[PDB]
Every structure is written in structure tokens, then in C-alpha cells.
């Protein structure tokens, strides 16, 4: 082949390396990557504990391997590293329902949701919105109506009605209703269904993606 023995051994080495890279790449296409995001001082850590710079958490549920890239402890520009995460399966979003009384923390959470859901890299990536601390909100709502932070609210200070109103306010900020869906789950400090909600939402995203991909749309 007009190559000495050394170059043929080099080509055998290149072939071995390509075999290893292809195997590892087929392997890492089986895992589900979930960017875990959230406002400051939310239920992000308790969710992390219940489910199991960049901090990764590996876990599995019914032979599906997940990965949760918690982006905590990086107070820098989001526009400069957010495009690294283009291609995650879903975005987990943890908001504290008890923060509507402490400008307004819920308004800042809604602003971050608006900046993330309508971002130009995430025009096809669903969101698995979590609402933590439902019980402290349940206890606080019976004493202070949402008018302190939601002036347009003209309903009762009851857990179900107000929780549905907040869920609607958060689902409303989605401006791409026909390409991404927002799955909302009301969780608490001791709720054994979080991994179930994430597994079901990830299966739905995977199936709708295979539909968009295999040509059915």
C-alpha cells in the first residue's frame, strides 16, 4: 500500500480509537439529560435530594439513565454558556410557591421563566415545571390573599383555586404553544412521586420527538 510497517500500525491504532469513540457515542445517546434550573432560594436542593460549577447527578428509574446538570454557583452571563445546553431532553424548573410574600420574588421567578422559555436555543425543548413548598403556601394562603402580589386576582384565598391561578400565570408565559409543552407538577417537601413525574414527562418528550423526527410531525 506504499506504507511502511509503522504507518500500517498507526492506521490500526486509528481504527481502534474510532471503534472506541463510536461505542461510547452510541452509549451516551441512550441517556436523558435534564438541565436543572431555578430561581434563587427555591426548592432546588430538596428536589435534588429526593430524586437521588456544573454539578451532575446520575440516577436511573426503570432502565432509563438520567443526568441532571445543576448550574448552581455560576454568577456569570447566561448568554455566554447557555448554548452549551442546546439539545437537553427537557428543562426542569423549580419555583417556590411560598415566595409570593417576599421586587416580588415571584415576579423575578416569572421573569427568569420568561427569559428561559422564550430563549432562541430552546424553541423545541419542553419544560418540566415544579412548584415546591406547596404546604407552606397552603398554610400561608389562608392568612394573606394573593392581592399583595397578584393585583388582578379576584378569587378566593383557597389552595386549589389560587394554585390553579398561579399554574395558569406560569403556563401563559410560553409563547411557542405548538412546539413545546410545559408539564407542571405540584410537589412538596415529602412527596414520593417526583421521579415518577419526571419519568412520565421524559417518556412523553421522547415519543413526541420521535414523532417529529420519523416524519409524522
Amino acid at each position: 500500500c506504499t506504507l511502511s510497517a509503522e504507518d500500517k500500525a498507526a492506521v490500526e491504532r486509528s481504527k481502534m480509537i474510532d471503534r472506541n469513540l463510536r461505542e461510547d457515542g452510541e452509549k451516551a445517546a441512550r441517556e436523558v439529560k435534564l438541565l436543572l434550573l431555578g430561581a434563587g432560594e427555591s426548592g432546588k436542593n430538596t428536589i435534588v435530594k429526593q430524586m437521588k460549577g456544573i454539578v451532575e447527578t446520575h440516577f436511573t428509574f426503570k432502565d432509563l439513565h438520567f443526568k441532571m446538570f445543576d448550574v448552581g454557583a455560576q454568577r456569570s452571563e447566561r448568554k455566554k454558556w447557555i448554548h452549551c445546553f442546546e439539545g437537553v431532553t427537557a428543562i426542569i424548573f423549580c419555583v417556590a410557591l411560598s415566595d409570593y410574600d417576599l421586587m416580588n420574588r415571584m415576579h423575578a421567578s416569572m421573569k427568569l421563566f420568561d427569559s428561559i422559555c422564550n430563549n432562541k436555543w430552546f424553541t423545541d425543548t419542553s419544560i418540566i415545571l415544579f412548584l415546591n413548598k406547596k404546604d407552606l403556601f397552603e398554610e400561608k394562603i389562608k392568612k394573606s390573599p394573593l392581592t399583595i402580589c397578584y393585583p388582578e386576582y379576584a378569587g378566593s384565598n383557597t389552595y386549589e383555586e389560587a394554585a390553579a391561578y398561579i399554574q395558569c400565570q406560569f403556563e401563559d408565559l410560553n409563547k411557542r404553544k405548538d412546539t413545546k409543552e410545559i408539564y407542571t407538577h405540584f410537589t412538596c417537601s415529602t412527596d414520593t412521586k417526583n421521579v415518577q413525574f419526571v419519568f412520565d414527562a421524559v417518556t412523553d418528550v421522547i415519543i413526541k420527538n420521535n414523532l417529529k423526527d420519523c416524519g409524522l410531525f
Binding site: 432509563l64 404553544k177 409543552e181 420519523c214 416524519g215 409524522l216 410531525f217
Partner: protein, 300 residues
């Protein structure tokens, strides 16, 4: 009266196919994009070698081409029937592997996707399409003084049992070319339809508009094929069976009067396949329109 209609109908489907599948092949040069490309090749090959039989029917017995072309063109038209039906069914089974079981069926889609299904379906097509040129010759019959194209069934078997040979060949091609592939496609699309109906919630605000487009396209995807490839094999086996048991004269005559049309109906699906598999997803719409408008002038 049909002597000019049949050739004109063949020309109409030729112009349609060499346009639709031509544009599809041009625009496709995503999984299930090998099968679209393979399907496009079958349509282009399937209708391109038709004008020879178009001209031939014009006289109904005059075959002004070589004895060899009675082998090449017939082999092309048979290998293409089998490849197109086999590929379309492999395409539906790939869709099933990808949409019904997306987690537990990763390995099977890694093994029997467009990597192996394409080669194996084409090999089975060529391997089943052998008796179409092995047994086909040409002869100038003194009873008409016209060089006709026909099959002998003598180059392999004895004439003493020619009725059983034709029966067996006719039953076998439909069994391996329309029975099994259509059942497979029906099962795969039934399960995909159950899944689409289960996943996309109906009790949504303008979210079910993704539930009627998909279910409609699945129903059309099955019904087009079930209504194109059915009458052909229906009349074919009906005639080959009824003429052997017990039959009248108003039945067989109608069958022979309607077969040159059932053999023209099975050529419209070949032209429809792009507008059902390839130009349905809005991804080929945009790319193909951009490509069709780039180099082509804005003024006709």
C-alpha cells in the same frame, strides 16, 4: 376504445412519477430518510421503463423492441413492485419501533433500521423476481403476424401440468407481495395510532390539532395502499381461480375487460408515495421549495 386510453393513462402516470419522485430524489440529496430515498428510486425506476409497454399496447400485439427488453423491462417492473411494497412496509415497521416503544426498543432499531432493512429488502426483491425473466421470452405468432411479448412456462416445467404452475405462481406472488406486507403495515399503524391517541391529550386548548393531523395521516397512509394494491391482485387471482373451478361467460369477459385498468390503478400509488411520505412533513416543504426557487427564475 381502450386501445388508446391505456397507453395515454400509462403516459399520464409516467409524467407524474418522473416528476414527483424525481423532485423527492433531488431534494433528499433524520432516520426514515433512507427509506424515502429507496422508495423514490422504486417509483422513478417503476414508471421510467413504462413507455416501452405504452407504445406496445397501442397495437396490443406489436412489440417493436428486442427480445431482450421483454426480459429487462418485465424484470424491472416486477422487482420494483416487490421492492416498493417491501420498502414501504419496512418504513412502517421502523416507525413502529421508534414511536411505540422508544425506550425498550432502542437496540432493535439500532439493528434493523435503514442500515440492514434496505439491503435485505432489495435482496429479497431481486431473489423473488427471478421467474419473471427466466421464463419470459418473445415470439412472433403466425396467427397475428405480430411480434408479441408473452410467457411460456415451458423453459422449466412440463406442459402436462401447466395449469398448476400458473396457479402456484399467481397465488405465491400475491401471498409474498400483498398479503404479508399489508398485514404487517396494518398492525404497525394500528399500534402507532393507539399510541398517538393515548399520548396527545384531547382535553386541551388547541392542543388536539396535533391529534387529528396525525390520525388522519395514518388512516390515509393505510387506506391509499389498501385501495391501490388491492383491486389488482383481487381481479388477478379472481380470474385465475374462477376460470379453473366453474364460471360463466359474463364473469370472465368482465374480468378480461377490466384487467387493463386494474393494472393502471396500481401505478397511481407509485406517483402518490411522495405526497404521502416525503412532502407531508414540513421539513421537506421548506428545503425543497428553497431549492426549487434558488436556481429557478422568478419569471416563467
Amino acid at each position: 376504445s381502450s386501445g388508446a386510453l391505456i397507453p395515454a393513462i400509462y403516459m399520464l402516470v409516467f409524467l407524474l412519477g418522473t416528476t414527483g419522485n424525481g423532485l423527492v430524489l433531488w431534494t433528499v440529496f433524520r432516520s426514515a430518510d433512507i427509506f424515502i430515498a429507496s422508495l423514490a428510486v422504486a417509483d422513478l425506476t417503476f414508471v421510467v421503463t413504462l413507455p416501452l409497454w405504452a407504445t406496445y399496447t397501442y397495437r396490443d400485439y406489436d412489440w417493436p423492441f428486442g427480445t431482450f427488453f421483454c426480459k429487462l423491462s418485465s424484470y424491472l417492473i416486477f422487482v420494483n413492485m416487490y421492492a416498493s411494497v417491501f420498502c414501504l412496509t419496512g418504513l412502517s415497521f421502523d416507525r413502529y419501533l421508534a414511536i411505540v416503544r422508544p425506550v425498550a426498543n432502542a437496540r432493535l432499531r439500532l439493528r434493523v433500521s435503514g442500515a440492514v432493512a434496505t439491503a435485505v429488502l432489495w435482496v429479497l426483491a431481486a431473489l423473488l423476481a427471478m421467474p419473471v425473466m427466466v421464463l419470459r421470452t418473445t415470439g412472433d405468432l403466425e396467427n397475428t403476424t405480430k411480434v408479441q411479448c408473452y410467457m411460456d412456462y415451458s423453459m422449466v416445467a412440463t406442459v402436462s401440468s401447466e395449469w398448476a404452475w400458473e396457479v402456484g405462481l399467481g397465488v405465491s406472488s400475491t401471498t409474498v407481495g400483498f398479503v404479508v406486507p399489508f398485514t404487517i403495515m396494518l398492525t404497525c399503524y394500528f399500534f402507532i395510532a393507539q399510541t398517538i391517541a393515548g399520548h396527545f391529550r384531547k382535553e386541551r386548548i388547541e392542543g388536539l390539532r396535533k391529534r387529528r393531523r396525525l390520525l388522519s395521516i395514518i388512516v390515509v397512509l393505510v387506506v391509499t395502499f389498501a385501495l391501490c394494491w388491492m383491486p389488482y391482485h383481487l381481479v388477478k387471482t379472481l380470474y385465475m381461480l374462477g376460470s379453473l373451478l366453474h364460471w360463466p361467460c359474463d364473469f370472465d369477459l368482465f374480468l378480461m375487460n377490466i384487467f387493463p385498468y386494474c393494472t393502471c390503478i396500481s401505478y397511481v400509488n407509485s406517483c402518490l408515495n411522495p405526497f404521502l411520505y416525503a412532502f407531508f412533513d414540513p421539513r421537506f416543504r421548506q428545503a425543497c421549495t428553497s431549492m426549487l426557487c434558488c436556481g429557478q427564475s422568478r419569471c416563467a
